[PDB]
Write a protein that binds this ligand. Sequence first.
Ligand code: UVE
Ligand code: UVE
Ligand code: CL
Ligand code: CL
Ligand code: CL
Ligand code: CL
Ligand code: MG
Ligand code: MG
Lengths: 9, 9, 225, 225
Amino acid sequence: AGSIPGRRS
Amino acid sequence: AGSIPGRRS
Amino acid sequence: MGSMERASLIQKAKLAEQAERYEDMAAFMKGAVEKGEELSCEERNLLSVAYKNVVGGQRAAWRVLSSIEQKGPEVREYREKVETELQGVCDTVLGLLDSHLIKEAGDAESRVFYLKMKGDYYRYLAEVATGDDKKRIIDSARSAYQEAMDISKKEMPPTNPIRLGLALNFSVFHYEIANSPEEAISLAKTTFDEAMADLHTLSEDSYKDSTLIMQLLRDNLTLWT
Amino acid sequence: MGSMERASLIQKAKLAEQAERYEDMAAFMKGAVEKGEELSCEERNLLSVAYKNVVGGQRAAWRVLSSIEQKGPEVREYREKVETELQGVCDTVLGLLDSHLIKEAGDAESRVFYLKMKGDYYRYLAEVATGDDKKRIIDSARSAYQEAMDISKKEMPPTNPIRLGLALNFSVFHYEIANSPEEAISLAKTTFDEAMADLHTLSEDSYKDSTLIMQLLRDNLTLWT
Ligand SMILES: *Cc1ccc(S(=O)(=O)N2CCOc3ccccc32)cc1
Ligand SMILES: *Cc1ccc(S(=O)(=O)N2CCOc3ccccc32)cc1
Ligand SMILES: [Cl-]
Ligand SMILES: [Cl-]
Ligand SMILES: [Cl-]
Ligand SMILES: [Cl-]
Ligand SMILES: [Mg+2]
Ligand SMILES: [Mg+2]
C-alpha cells in the first residue's frame, strides 16, 4: 500500500 | 549523444 | 552546517532537490533545523521531502537484501549494514523532531505535520525491528499518529491535505505494521467519505489537492478489499 | 575495506548492484582492486558499472546546477561542491587504474578495457574543466583512448563489444569534448560499417551484443547528421 509522497507528483 | 552503458539493459 | 546562514541552507536544499541530491538536501535541512528557529510550511515540506527520499531508498534496498537473505555471512552482513544506516537516519529525524520542533509547534498545521513525521519514522524503524524493543517501537509510532489524529479532527477540516495524508499513513501503519487490516480499511473508508462530503467547500486548487489524496486512499482500499 | 576478504567484497558488490546502492558498490570494488590481484572480466565490469553509475549521477546533478547558474553565491557554491566531489571520484578511479591495474594488464581485453576507462574518467574531468590544466586533461583523455584504439585494432575483431564501446565513447569525446564533430562522425560510421561486415562470423548471442552497440553508434549518427 502507498503512503503520502513527498511532492504532489 | 550516448556513451556505453554499464550493463546491456 | 553551523557556519552557513539559515537562508543559504534553505536555498541549497531547494537546489539539491532540483538536482535530485537528496542526501545533500537532508543535510542542508538538518542544518536549517539546528539553527533553532521554527520552520515555515514550505520549509517543513523541504525537511520531509529530503528525509522521506533518503529513507525511502534505504527501505527499498533493505527489502531487496532481506528478500535475498530469506531465499556465507555476506548477505546478512550487508543487510545489517543497510539496516543500521536506515536506523541512523530515522534516529536523526526523530532527534530533530524531539529537539525541538514538536515542542515549539503550537499551530495545528505544524504540530500535526511533525507528529505525522514522528509516526512515520517510528514506522520505518518498526519495519526492520525484531528485538526486545519492537513492541515499544510500534507503540511509539501508534502514539504519535494518535496524537496527530486527535488534533487534526478537532482543528482541521476533513479535506485538509495534512489531515488526509496523516490518515493515509496511519492506515498503512494499521495494515502493514499493527496487523490490523480491518482498522486500516475502516480508517481509509471513513476518511475518504468525510472528505468527499466536504469537497463542495473548496476552491479548484484545494479540490485538486484533496482529491489527489482521496485517490491514494481509494488505491489502498482497492488493494486491501 | 582492508579487513574484508576479496571474495566477500566481490559478493557484496554484486548485492549492492541488485539493491541499487552504487556508492557502496564502488567502495566494495575499490577495496577489491586494492587487494592487489588482477581482475577477471566479470570483476572489471563490476568496477566499471559501480563508478559509471556514481559519476553519472554526479554529472547529471552538475548539469542541473550549471544550467541554473548560467541562467547570491549559493548556486555557484553548490555547483562547486558537486564539482569537487565529482573530481574526487574521477581521481579515485584514475588512481586505481594507475596503481596498478593498467600496468599489470597484458591481455588485449583487459588493457583495452582499462585504457577506455582512463579515457572516460579524463573525459568526465574535461566536462567540468575551465582552468590552466584543461587542455592537458583533454589530451590525457585523447592519449588513453588512442592507445586503447591502437591495441583494439591490432588484437580484436571489429565486432568485439569492448572495441565497439571504446569507439563509441571516443566518438563522443571527439564530438562533445574535442570540438571535432567530423572526426566523431567518421569514427562512428567506419566502426559501424566494419562491424556490420563481420557479423556473419558471430553466434546468436555475440550477434546480439555487437548489434546492440552498433545501434548506439547509429543513434549518435542520427543525432549528429
Ligand atoms: C503529510 C503531508 C500531506 C500533505 C502535504 S501537501 O503539502 O499538501 N502535499 C505535498 C505532499 O504530497 C501531496 C499530495 C497531494 C496533495 C498535496 C500534497 C504534505 C505533507
Ligand atoms: C566498454 C565496454 C563495452 C562493452 C562491454 S560488455 O561487457 O560487452 N557489455 C556491458 C556494457 O554494455 C553492453 C552493451 C551491449 C553489449 C554488451 C555490453 C563492457 C564494457
Ligand atoms: Cl557489509
Ligand atoms: Cl511556536
Ligand atoms: Cl555548498
Ligand atoms: Cl598480467
Ligand atoms: Mg544568521
Ligand atoms: Mg584473503
